[PDB]
Amino acid sequence: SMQEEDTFRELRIFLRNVTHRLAIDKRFRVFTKPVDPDEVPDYVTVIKQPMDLSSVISKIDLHKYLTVKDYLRDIDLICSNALEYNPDRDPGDRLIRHRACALRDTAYAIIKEELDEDFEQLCEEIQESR
Template sequence: MDQLRVEDLKGDPLSNPPPPPPSSLALQCEEVLPVAETLDARVLSPEEQRRLADQEENTLRELRLFLRDVTRRLAVDKRFNIFSKPVDIEEVSDYLEVIRQPMDLSTVMTKIDTHKYLTANDFLVDIDLICSNALEYNPDKDPSGTHGGIKVLAMPYLHPIPFIVHYF
């Protein structure tokens, strides 16, 4: 049996080249093994299914509580008050011609309450939509940077939660 010796490690590595790969004849002589059977998925007992469903519902409840808190904080912040209700179409008649998918914080809150968000990322997509709609409709009218700021303000609230993947 060939063993690696300390002497083999000294000197020029090219003076002790590794052994050549096995020849194709040696590979042809190897035994071909049959493909292993695939295992059927384990069937959960009714009790295990109930516990799993309860755990999932608890996780989603925690997510909804968290998202409500973030949305409430954004809605009460005076800098983002303009995003708290849908755009008044009577006041801004061309809004729906420019924006195909309107979004606001009250709609976000309704989606939270009706269990439309199954992940934090779903919520963040709507927050991003609020920002992009504002920037699309008002491309040069926002010197304060408020439209993009809603995303920045939401980030500290979202950062410590473990199920939030880096979105921004």
């Protein structure tokens, strides 16, 4: 229905805004674009499902997220990929893991404060009906 399409458009607007706020945070610069294979040649071999905030925006725009839960799975993926690819005690790895955890926690915190639970429940119910 057109009311349903209006719901999903509102979702997309909300998600772009959260994603923009994450993307402009200097701590998260490393997560804003896909990994450069020149710079990191084995990345695309080790990490099976690369994700980054530019790709998140492309997916919002492609109507691939019908719920905040689906969006959060991709935020989670950005984080788990970083924990998997940089697991060492070395300070570079530890820095990127900290930042990955901060990205995830920040996204969850924004969503906890700003997403109405009934809005999300509506999205989920429309999704389940299709």
